[PDB]
Amino acid sequence: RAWVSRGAHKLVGALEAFAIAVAGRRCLDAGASTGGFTEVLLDRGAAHVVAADVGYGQLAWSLRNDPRVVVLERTNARGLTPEAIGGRVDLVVADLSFISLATVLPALVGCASRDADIVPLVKPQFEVGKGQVGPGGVVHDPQLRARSVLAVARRAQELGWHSVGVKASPLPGPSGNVEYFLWLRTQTDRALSAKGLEDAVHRAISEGP
Numbered sequence: 001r002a003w004v005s006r007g008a009h010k011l012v013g014a015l016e017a018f019a020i021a022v023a024g025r026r027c028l029d030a031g032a033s034t035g036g037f038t039e040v041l042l043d044r045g046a047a048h049v050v051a052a053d054v055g056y057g058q059l060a061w062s063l064r065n066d067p068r069v070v071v072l073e074r075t076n077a078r079g080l081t082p083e084a085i086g087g088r089v090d091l092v093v094a095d096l097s098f099i100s101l102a103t104v105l106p107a108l109v110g111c112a113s114r115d116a117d118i119v120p121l122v123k124p125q126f127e128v129g130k131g132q133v134g135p136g137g138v139v140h141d142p143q144l145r146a147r148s149v150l151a152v153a154r155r156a157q158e159l160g161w162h163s164v165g166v167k168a169s170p171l172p173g174p175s176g177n178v179e180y181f182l183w184l185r186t187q188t189d190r191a192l193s194a195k196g197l198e199d200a201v202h203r204a205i206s207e208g209p
């Protein structure tokens with residue numbers, strides 16, 4: 001509940017920062033821990049949302065019963081395919097815990113159309129190496145958070161997916177980690193250059209939540 005509010009607030013921050021249209025589009029929520037992302041997508045006029053159930057907890061039935069929502073069960077983010085979700089989508093969102101986006105990005109890409117937006121939430125606490133998460137489970141070093149974002153961007157680019165924008169999530173995670181949405185597209189004329197991405201990342205880190 002409180003958690004659904006928090007998820008919804010985060011994704012509105014992302015959609016607005018990036019000017020991504022949702023109306024009439026097919027969407028995938030790659031790790032629906034809360035129905036927050038899903039509710040926002042419905043609210044902003046998605047034609048259809050595939051919500052991948054994480055296997056613990058429970059998405060609200062009222063969400064499951066919505067005619068525009070398919071809850072996909074028994075399948076973590078790396079296992080997702082077009083076949084599994086009923087075809088390629090126009091918008092992919094992911095708020096995943098305890099896993100690096102580098103490992104999941106190939107499946108997410110595999111679920112996306114040519115013309116799609118992919119907007120993962122980069123969580124440095126699950127990207128940095130051992131010894132680098134500080135006291136309280138937070139990545140305190142802003143340069144490490146920046147590198148985290150750049151590493152995911154590099155991984156995406158190896159896959160043909162360019163970085164178009166970065167935006168700090170307006171709420172920190174519950175233990176205090178600042179987390180960052182990265183906007184990825186493969187068909188674009190406004191892809192950030194290396195310097196352009198560095199600038200985008202540095203401003204996002206300096207802004208904060």
Ligand SMILES: [Cl-]
Nearest residue numbers: 173175176177
């Ligand atoms: Cl956190």
